[PDB]
């Protein structure tokens, strides 16, 4: 009935928005480990669902283009305004990712070596509710397998918006669908093992100690110490998974997830050891050790370099 737009096909149906490659490079961004809900469904063409809409972007040299799916067969026609600022906090494009790359780079001879080949690599404001539960699934797993896991879950579990081709699209689910009696072991079904305990806890843990998705804003606007502590007392989430919502979530750009990735990375790239801890590999005081140290060498946006080092390390 439907289908996917290109900027061929249909340039009626497309807006665009000013922006430099070197602000924004969608094939590095876009599936680098952020979001799982990005697919290159046509060549240089990245559909996918953003709060109960679907978009197409595409890009040139100097501009962003943009198609909306509205769904419930309403009158097809451009992205508004409002709906082109829902974009532009998505990739947070207020802030200069160029003035950044300079800024480090003065001391770190690494990163001067990487942002030449892998430049517009910008984190995205997504979601806290996405974002969580995302990352609960994300443990100990690949992009290639958590996207799996986060569509299956929003197939399941989130309403309908559009389908286009052979691809039913679904917005995220609310805390109440994942926190009910029956959910553990439907996600243990569609795949997700032992995380499949985490998404409902937490889910049931945010609605009844916490109160809701009010306490997600309330995390945002609360300082990233407070929030990270928060989050910790959820079921599955730990500075790990806590620090990924913090970064790409509640507006802690500071915020450094620390796996084994950022391990490897450090460790290899960076000739970087646990100095102070007694232990040789990961622990929980190593770990914030490592977060630190990032911290200290990039400054308070160390988590937005960190992602140009992990969309480098993937490719
Ligand atoms: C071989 C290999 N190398 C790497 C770096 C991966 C890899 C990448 C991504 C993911 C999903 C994930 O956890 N992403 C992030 N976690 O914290 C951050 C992110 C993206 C950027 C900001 C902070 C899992 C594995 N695989």
Not at 208 to 221: D, F, K, N, S
Not at 275 to 291: I, R, Y
């Amino acid at each position: 009935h439907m289908r996917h737009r290109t900027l061929s096909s249909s340039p009626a149906l497309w807006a665009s928005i000013p922006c430099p490659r070197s602000e924004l490079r969608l094939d590095l961004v876009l599936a680098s480990g952020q979001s799982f809900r990005w697919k290159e469904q046509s060549p240089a063409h990245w559909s996918g669902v953003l709060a109960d809409q679907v978009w197409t972007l595409t890009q040139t040299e100097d501009q962003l283009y943009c198609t909306v799916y509205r769904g419930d067969d309403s009158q097809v026609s451009r992205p508004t305004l409002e709906e082109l600022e829902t974009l532009h906090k998505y990739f947070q494009l207020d802030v200069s990712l160029a003035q950044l790359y300079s800024h480090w780079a003065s001391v770190d001879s690494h990163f001067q070596r990487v942002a030449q080949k892998f430049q517009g690599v910008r984190l995205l404001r997504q979601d806290p509710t996405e974002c969580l539960f995302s990352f609960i699934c994300s443990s100990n797993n690949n992009i290639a397998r958590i996207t799996g896991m986060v569509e299956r879950l929003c197939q399941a579990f989130g309403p309908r918006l559009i389908q286009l081709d052979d691809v039913t699209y679904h917005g995220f689910p609310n805390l109440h669908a994942l926190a009910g009696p029956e959910a553990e072991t439907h996600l243990r079904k569609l795949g997700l093992g032992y995380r499949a305990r985490y998404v409902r806890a937490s889910a049931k843990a945010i609605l009844e100690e916490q109160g809701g998705p009010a306490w997600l804003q309330q995390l945002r606007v609360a300082p990233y110490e407070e929030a990270h502590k928060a989050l910790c007392t959820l079921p599955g989430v730990g500075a790990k998974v806590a620090d990924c919502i913090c970064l790409m979530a509640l507006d802690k750009p500071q915020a450094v997830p620390v796996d084994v990735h950022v391990w490897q990375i450090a460790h290899r790239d960076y000739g970087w050891h646990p100095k102070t801890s007694q232990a040789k590999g990961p622990s929980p005081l190593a770990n914030k050790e490592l977060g630190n140290f990032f911290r200290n060498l990039w400054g308070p946006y160390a988590g937005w370099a960190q992602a140009v080092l992990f969309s480098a390390d993937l490719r």
